[PDB]
Coordinates of C-alpha atoms and ligand atoms in Angstrom, one line a residue:
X95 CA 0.0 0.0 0.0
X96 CA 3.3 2.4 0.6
X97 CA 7.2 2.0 -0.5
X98 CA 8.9 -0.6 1.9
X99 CA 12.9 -0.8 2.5
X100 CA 15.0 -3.2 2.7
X101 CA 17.8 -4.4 5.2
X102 CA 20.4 -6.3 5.1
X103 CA 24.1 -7.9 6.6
X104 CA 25.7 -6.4 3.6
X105 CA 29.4 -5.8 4.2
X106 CA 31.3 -2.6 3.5
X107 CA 34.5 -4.7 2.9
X108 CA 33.2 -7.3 0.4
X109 CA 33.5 -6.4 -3.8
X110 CA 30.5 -9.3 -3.9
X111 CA 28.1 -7.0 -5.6
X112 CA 24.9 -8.2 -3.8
X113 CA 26.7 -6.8 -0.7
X114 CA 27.7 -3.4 -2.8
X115 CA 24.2 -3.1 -3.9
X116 CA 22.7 -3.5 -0.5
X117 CA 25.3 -1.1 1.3
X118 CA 23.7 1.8 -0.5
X119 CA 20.2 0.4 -1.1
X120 CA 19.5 -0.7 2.5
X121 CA 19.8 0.1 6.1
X122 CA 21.1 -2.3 8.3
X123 CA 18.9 -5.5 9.9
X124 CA 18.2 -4.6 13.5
X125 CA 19.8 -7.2 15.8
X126 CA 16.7 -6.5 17.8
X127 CA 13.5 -7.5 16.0
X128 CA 9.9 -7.3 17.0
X129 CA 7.2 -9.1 16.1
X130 CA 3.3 -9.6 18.0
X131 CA 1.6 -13.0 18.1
X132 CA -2.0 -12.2 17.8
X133 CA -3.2 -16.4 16.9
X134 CA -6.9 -15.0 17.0
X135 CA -7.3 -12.8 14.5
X136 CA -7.9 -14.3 11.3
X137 CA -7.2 -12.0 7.9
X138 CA -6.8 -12.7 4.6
X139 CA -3.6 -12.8 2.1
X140 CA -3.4 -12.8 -1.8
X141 CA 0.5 -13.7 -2.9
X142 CA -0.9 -13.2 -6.6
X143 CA -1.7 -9.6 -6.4
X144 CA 1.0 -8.7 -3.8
X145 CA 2.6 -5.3 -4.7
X146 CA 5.6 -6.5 -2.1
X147 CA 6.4 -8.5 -5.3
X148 CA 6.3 -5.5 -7.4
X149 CA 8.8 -3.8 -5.2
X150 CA 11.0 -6.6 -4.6
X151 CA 10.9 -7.3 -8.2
X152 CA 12.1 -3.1 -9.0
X153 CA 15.0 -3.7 -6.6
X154 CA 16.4 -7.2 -8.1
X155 CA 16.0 -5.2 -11.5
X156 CA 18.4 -2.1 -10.3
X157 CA 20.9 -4.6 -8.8
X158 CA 21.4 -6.6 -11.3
X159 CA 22.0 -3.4 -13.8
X160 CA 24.6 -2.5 -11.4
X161 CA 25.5 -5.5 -10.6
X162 CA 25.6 -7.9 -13.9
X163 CA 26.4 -5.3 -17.1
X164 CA 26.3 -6.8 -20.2
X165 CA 28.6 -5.9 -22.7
X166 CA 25.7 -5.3 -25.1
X167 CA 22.4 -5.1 -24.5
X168 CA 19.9 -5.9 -27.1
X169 CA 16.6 -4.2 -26.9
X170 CA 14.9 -4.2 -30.5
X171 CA 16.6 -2.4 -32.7
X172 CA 18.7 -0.6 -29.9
X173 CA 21.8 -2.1 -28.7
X174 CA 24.1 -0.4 -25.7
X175 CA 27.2 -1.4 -25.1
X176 CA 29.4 -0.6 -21.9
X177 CA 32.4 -2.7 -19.8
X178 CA 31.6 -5.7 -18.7
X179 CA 34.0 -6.8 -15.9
X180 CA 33.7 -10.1 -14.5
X181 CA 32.3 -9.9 -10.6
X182 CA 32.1 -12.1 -7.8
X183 CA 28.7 -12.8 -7.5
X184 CA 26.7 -14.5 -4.4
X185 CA 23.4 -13.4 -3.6
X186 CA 23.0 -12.0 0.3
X187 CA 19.8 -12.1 2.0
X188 CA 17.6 -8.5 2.2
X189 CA 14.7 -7.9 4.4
X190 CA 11.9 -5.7 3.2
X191 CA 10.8 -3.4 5.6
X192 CA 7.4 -1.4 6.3
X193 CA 8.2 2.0 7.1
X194 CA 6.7 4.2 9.7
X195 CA 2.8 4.3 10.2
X196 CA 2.9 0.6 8.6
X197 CA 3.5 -2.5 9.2
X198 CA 4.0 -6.1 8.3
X199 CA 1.4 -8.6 8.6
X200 CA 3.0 -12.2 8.7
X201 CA 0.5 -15.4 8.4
X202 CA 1.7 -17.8 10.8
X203 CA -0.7 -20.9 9.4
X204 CA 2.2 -23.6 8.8
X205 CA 0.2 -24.4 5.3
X206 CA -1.2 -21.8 4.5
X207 CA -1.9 -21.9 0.6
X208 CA -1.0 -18.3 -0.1
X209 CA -4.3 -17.6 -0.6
X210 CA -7.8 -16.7 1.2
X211 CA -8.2 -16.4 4.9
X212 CA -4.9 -17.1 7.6
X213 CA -6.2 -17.7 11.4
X214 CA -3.1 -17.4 13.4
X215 CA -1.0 -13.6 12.8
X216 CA 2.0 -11.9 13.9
X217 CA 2.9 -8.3 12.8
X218 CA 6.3 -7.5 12.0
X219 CA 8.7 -5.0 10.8
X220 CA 10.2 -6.4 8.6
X221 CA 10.2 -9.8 6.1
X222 CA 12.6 -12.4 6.8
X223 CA 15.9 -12.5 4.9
X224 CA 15.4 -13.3 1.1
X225 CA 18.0 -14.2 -0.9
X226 CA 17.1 -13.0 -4.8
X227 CA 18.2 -16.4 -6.7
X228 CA 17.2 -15.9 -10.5
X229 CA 16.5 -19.2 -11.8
X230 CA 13.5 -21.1 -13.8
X231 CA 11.8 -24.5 -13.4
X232 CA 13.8 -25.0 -10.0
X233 CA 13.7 -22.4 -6.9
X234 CA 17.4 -22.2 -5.1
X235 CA 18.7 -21.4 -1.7
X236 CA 14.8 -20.9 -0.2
X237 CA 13.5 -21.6 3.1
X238 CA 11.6 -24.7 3.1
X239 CA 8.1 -25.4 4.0
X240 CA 7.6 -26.4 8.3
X241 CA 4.8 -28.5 7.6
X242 CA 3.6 -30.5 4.4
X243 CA 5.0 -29.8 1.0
X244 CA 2.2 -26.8 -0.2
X245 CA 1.0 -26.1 -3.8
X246 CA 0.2 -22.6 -4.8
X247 CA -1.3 -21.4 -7.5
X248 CA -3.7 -18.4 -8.7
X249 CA -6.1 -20.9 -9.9
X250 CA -5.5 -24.7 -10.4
X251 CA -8.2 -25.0 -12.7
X252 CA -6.5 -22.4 -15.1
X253 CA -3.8 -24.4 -16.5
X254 CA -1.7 -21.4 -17.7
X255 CA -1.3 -20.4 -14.7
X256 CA 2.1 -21.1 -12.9
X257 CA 2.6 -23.4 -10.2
X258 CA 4.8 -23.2 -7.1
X259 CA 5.5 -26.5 -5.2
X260 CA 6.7 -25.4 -1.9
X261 CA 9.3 -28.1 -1.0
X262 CA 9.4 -29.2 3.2
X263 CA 12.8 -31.2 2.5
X264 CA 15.6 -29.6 0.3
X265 CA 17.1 -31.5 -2.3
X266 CA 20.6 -30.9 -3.2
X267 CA 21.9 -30.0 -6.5
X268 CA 25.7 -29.2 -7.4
X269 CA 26.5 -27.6 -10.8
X270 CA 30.1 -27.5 -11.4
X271 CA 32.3 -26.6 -14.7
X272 CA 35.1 -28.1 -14.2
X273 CA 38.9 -27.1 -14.4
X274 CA 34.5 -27.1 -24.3
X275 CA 34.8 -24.5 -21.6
X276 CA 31.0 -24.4 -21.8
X277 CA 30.4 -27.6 -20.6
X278 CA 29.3 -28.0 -17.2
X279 CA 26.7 -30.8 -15.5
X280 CA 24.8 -30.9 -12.0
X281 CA 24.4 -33.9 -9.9
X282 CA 21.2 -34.7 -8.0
X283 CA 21.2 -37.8 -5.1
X284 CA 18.3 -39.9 -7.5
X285 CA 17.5 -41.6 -4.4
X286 CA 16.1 -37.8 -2.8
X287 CA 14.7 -36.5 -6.0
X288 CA 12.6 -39.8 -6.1
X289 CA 11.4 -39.4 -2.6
X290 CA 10.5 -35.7 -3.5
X291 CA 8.6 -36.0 -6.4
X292 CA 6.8 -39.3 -4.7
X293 CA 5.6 -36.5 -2.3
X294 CA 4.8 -34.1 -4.9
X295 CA 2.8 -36.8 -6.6
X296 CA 0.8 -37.5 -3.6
X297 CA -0.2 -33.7 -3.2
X298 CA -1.1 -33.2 -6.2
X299 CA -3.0 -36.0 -6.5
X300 CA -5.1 -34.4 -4.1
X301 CA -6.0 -31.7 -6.2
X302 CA -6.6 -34.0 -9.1
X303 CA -7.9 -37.1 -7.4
X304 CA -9.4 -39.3 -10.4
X305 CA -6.0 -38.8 -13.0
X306 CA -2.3 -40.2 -13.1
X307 CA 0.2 -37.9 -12.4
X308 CA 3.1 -37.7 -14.6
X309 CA 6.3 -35.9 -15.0
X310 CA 7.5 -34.5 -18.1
X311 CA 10.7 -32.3 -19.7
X312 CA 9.0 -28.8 -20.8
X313 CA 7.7 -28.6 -24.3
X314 CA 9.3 -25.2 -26.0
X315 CA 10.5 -21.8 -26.0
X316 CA 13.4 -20.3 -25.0
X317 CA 16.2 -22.1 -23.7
X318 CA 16.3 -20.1 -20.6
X319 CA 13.0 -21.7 -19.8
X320 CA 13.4 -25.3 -21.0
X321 CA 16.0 -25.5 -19.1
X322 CA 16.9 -24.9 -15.5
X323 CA 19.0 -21.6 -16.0
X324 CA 20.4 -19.8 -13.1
X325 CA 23.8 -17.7 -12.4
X326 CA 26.6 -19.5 -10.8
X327 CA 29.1 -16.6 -9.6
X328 CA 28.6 -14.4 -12.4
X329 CA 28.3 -17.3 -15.3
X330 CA 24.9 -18.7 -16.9
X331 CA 24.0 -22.0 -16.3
X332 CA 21.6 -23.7 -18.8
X333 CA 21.5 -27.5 -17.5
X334 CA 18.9 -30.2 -19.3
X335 CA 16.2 -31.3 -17.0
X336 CA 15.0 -34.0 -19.6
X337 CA 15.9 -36.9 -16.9
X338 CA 14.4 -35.0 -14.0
X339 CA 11.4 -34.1 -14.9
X340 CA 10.6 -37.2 -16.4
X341 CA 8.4 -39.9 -13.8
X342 CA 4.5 -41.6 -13.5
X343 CA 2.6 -41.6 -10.2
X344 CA -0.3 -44.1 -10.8
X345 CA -1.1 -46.1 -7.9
X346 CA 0.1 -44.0 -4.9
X347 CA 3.2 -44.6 -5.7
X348 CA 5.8 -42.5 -8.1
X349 CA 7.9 -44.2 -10.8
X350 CA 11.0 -42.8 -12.2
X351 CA 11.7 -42.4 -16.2
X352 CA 14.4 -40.6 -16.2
X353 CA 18.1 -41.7 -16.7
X354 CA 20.4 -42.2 -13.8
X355 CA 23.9 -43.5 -13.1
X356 CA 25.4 -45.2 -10.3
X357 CA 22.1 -43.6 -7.8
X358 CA 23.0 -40.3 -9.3
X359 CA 20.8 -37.9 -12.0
X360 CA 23.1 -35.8 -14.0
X361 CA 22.1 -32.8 -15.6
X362 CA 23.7 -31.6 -19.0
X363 CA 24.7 -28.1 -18.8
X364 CA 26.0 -24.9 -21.2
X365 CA 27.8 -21.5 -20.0
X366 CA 26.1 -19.1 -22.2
X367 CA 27.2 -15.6 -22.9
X368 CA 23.7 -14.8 -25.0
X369 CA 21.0 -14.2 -22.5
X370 CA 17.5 -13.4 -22.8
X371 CA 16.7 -11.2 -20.3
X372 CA 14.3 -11.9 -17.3
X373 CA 14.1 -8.4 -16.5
X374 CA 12.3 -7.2 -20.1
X375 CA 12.1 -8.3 -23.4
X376 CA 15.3 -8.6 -25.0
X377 CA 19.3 -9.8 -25.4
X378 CA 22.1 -9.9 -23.2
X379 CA 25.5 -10.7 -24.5
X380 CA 28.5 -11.7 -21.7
X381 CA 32.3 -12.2 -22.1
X382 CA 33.4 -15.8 -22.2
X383 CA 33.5 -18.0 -18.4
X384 CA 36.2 -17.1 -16.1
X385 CA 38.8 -19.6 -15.3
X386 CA 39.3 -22.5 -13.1
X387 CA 36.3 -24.5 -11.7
X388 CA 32.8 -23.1 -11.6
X389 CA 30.3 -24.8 -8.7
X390 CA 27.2 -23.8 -6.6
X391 CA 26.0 -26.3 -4.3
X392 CA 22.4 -25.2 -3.8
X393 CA 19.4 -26.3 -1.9
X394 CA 16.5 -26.7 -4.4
X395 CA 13.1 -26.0 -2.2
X396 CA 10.6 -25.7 -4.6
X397 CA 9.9 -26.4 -8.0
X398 CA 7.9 -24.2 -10.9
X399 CA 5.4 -26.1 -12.6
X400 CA 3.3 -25.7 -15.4
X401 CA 0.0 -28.3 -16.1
X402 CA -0.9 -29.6 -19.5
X403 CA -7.6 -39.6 -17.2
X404 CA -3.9 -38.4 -16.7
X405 CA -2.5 -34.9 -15.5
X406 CA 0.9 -33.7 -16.9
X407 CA 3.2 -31.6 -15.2
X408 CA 6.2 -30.0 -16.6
X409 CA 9.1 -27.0 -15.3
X410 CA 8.2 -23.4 -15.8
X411 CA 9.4 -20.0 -15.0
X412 CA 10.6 -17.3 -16.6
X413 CA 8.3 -14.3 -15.1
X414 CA 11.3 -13.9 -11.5
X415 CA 7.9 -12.6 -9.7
X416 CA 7.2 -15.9 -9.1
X417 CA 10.4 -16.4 -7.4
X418 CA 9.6 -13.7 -4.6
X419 CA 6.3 -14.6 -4.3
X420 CA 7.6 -18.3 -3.4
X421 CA 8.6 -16.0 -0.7
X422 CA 6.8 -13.2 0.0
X423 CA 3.3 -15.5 0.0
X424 CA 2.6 -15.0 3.8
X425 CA 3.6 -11.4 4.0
X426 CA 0.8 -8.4 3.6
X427 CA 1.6 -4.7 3.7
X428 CA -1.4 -2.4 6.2
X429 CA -2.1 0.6 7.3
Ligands
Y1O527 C1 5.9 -17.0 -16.8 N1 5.7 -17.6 -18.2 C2 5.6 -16.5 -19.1 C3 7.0 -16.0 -19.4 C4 8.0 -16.9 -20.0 C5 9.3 -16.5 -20.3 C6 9.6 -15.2 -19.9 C7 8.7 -14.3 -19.3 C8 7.4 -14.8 -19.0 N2 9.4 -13.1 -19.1 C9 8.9 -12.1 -18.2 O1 7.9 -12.2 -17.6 O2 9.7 -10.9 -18.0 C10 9.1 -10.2 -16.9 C11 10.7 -13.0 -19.7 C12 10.6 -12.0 -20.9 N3 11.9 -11.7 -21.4 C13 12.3 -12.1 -22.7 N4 11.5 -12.6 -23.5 N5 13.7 -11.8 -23.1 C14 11.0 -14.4 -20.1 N6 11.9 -14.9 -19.2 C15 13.3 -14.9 -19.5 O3 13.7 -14.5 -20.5 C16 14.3 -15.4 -18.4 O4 13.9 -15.8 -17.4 N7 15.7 -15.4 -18.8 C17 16.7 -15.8 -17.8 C18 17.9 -15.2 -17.9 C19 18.9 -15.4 -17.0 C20 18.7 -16.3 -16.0 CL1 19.9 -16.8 -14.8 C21 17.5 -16.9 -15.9 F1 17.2 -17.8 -14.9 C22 16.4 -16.7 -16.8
NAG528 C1 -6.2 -22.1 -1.3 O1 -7.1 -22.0 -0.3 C2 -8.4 -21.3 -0.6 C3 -9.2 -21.3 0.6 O2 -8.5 -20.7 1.7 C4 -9.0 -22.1 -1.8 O3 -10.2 -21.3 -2.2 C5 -8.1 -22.2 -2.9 O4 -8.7 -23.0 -3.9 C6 -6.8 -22.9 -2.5 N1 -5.8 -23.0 -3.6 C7 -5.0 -24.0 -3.8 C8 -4.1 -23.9 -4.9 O5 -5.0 -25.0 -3.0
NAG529 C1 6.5 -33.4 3.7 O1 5.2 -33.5 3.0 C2 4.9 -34.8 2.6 C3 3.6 -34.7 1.8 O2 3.2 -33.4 1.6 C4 4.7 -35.7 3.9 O3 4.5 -37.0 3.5 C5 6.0 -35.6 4.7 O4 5.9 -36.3 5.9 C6 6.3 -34.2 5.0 N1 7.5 -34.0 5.9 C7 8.7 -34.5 5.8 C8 9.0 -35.5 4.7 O5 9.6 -34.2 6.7
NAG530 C1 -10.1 -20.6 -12.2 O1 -10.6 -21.5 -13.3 C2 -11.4 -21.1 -14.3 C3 -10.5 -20.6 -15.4 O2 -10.1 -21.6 -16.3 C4 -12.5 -20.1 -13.9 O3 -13.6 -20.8 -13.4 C5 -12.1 -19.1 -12.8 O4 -11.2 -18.1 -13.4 C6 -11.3 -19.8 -11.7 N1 -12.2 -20.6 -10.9 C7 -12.1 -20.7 -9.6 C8 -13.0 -21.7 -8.9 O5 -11.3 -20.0 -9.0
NAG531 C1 17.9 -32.2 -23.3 O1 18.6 -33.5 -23.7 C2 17.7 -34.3 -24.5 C3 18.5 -35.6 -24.7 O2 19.9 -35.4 -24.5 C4 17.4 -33.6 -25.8 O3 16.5 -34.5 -26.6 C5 16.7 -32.3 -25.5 O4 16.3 -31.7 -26.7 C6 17.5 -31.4 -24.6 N1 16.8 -30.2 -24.3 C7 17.2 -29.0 -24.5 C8 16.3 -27.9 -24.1 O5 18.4 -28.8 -24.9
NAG532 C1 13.0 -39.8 -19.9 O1 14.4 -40.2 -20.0 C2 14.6 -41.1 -21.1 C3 16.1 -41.5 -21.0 O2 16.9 -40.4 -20.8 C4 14.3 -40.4 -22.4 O3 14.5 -41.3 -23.5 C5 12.9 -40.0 -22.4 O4 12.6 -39.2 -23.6 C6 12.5 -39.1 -21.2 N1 11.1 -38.8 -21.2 C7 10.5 -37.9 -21.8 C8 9.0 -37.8 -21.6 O5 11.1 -37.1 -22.5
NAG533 C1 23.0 -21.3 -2.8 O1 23.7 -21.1 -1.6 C2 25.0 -21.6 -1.5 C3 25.5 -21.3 -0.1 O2 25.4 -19.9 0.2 C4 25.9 -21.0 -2.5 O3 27.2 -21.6 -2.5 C5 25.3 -21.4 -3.9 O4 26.1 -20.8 -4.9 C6 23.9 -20.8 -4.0 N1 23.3 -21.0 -5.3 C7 23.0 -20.1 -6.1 C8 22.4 -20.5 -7.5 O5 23.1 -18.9 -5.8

């Protein structure tokens, strides 16, 4: 309803350019936080029209121009050019913050869908810390569900309309180049991402009780979007998903398609240095991978989906809204 802002641990000392950003975009976290159980009240949320997002999303636009310059950018016809350094590049957590005369409401329900009417609520000054991890068809480095794994949506029924699995148990996923300079590959533990997605079955088998559930590589587009892309310290990951999305839930119980190796999925992956852009419609060109060996060891806790007797589910993204909502769901701005 009003401009938040944010807070942070940034560091004066560190070059990282999350921190940089953050020393002269936000204030400091206060050691000392305050927050108001009120588990009577009852109020309701909407973390599809929350204009937190909006902000959060302006702010994760501005540092990454600061942050990330291309050495061209491609918009149309225009193209800007301008250095292109390489960085180091981790993102920090930031706290957004309602200013004086407002607050924070927080919905405390453990599984809470993002949607409709919460019971038990706090009132805060701030959000907790969020880290702003661009990636598609897998969220990175969240904080897990406490409860049962949760499935948002703006409407189930509408089948163009995203879905954000909410994991309660991280999986792990390394992505490393390694001392083509391009290629790179990620390994997932088969044995957790087969446990997950039985899970994952199971809820939404719920929501779609008579159908089969299956699993599936996404369709087209982009190759930012068909694959799981995400920036490892300051390079572009674009890693094949084909053999984890890729499974059949029938009979309560989840079967895995997908190729595997010694109880290990592997995941294909290209350093790219032509980007299209999250942050508007166009092209971002980089200079070639720095040296040496390139790995993030991530939590994935929660997954982007996108729905097609049987159901079929495949990996989605692409609109970076949806990331901070995966985040923001339980926080309302008042007063
Ligand atoms: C939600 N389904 C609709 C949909 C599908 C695809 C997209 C949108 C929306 N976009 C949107 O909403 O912009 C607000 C984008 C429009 N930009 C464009 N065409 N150049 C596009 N997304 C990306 O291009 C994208 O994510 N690139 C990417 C780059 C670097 C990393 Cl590390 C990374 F992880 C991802
Ligand atoms: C979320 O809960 C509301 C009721 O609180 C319900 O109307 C809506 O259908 C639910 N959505 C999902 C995706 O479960
Ligand atoms: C996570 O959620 C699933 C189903 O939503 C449930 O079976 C499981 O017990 C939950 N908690 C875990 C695995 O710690
Ligand atoms: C979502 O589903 C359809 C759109 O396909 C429509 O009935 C309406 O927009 C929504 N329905 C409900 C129950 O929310
Ligand atoms: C992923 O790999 C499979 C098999 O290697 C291939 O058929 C598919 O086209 C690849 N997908 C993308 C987006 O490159
Ligand atoms: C699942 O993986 C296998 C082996 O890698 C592949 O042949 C198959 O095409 C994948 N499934 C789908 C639906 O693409
Ligand atoms: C996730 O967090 C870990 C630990 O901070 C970090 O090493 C990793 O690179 C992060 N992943 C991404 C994609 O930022």
């Amino acid at each position: 309803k009003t401009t938040l802002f944010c807070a942070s641990d940034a560091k004066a000392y560190e070059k990282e350019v999350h921190n940089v950003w953050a020393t002269h975009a936000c204030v400091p976290t206060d050691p000392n936080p305050q927050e108001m159980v009120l588990a009577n009240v009852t109020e309701n949320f909407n973390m599809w029209k929350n204009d937190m997002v909006e902000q959060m999303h302006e702010d994760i636009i501005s540092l990454w121009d600061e942050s990330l310059k291309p050495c061209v950018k491609l918009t149309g016809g225009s193209a800007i050019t301008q250095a292109c350094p390489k960085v180091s590049f981790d993102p920090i957590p930031l706290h957004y913050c309602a200013p004086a005369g407002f607050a924070i409401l927080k919905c405390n329900n453990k599984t809470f869908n993002g949607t409709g009417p919460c019971r038990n609520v706090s009132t805060v000054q701030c959000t907790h810390g969020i880290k702003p991890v661009v990636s598609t068809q897998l969220l990175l480095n969240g904080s897990l569900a406490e409860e049962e794994i949760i499935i948002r949506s703006e409407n189930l029924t509408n089948n163009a309309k995203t879905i954000i699995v909410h994991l309660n148990e991280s999986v792990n996923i390394v992505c490393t180049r390694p001392n083509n300079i391009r290629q790179a590959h990620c390994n997932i533990n088969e044995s957790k991402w087969n446990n997950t997605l039985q899970k994952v079955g199971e809820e939404l088998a719920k929501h779609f009780p008579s159908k089969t559930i299956k699993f599936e590589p996404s369709s087209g587009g982009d190759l930012e979007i068909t694959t799981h892309s995400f920036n490892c310290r300051g390079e572009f990951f674009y890693c094949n998903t084909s053999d984890l999305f890729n499974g059949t839930y029938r009979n309560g119980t989840y079967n895995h398609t997908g190729r595997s190796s010694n109880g290990t999925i592997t995941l294909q992956c290209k350093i790219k240095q032509i980007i299209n852009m999250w942050q508007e419609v166009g092209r971002a060109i980089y200079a070639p991978p720095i040296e040496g060996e390139i790995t993030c060891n991530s939590n994935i806790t929660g997954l982007l989906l996108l729905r097609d007797d049987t159901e079929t589910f495949r990996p989605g993204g692409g609109d970076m809204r949806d990331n901070w909502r995966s985040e923001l769901y339980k926080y309302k701005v008042v007063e």
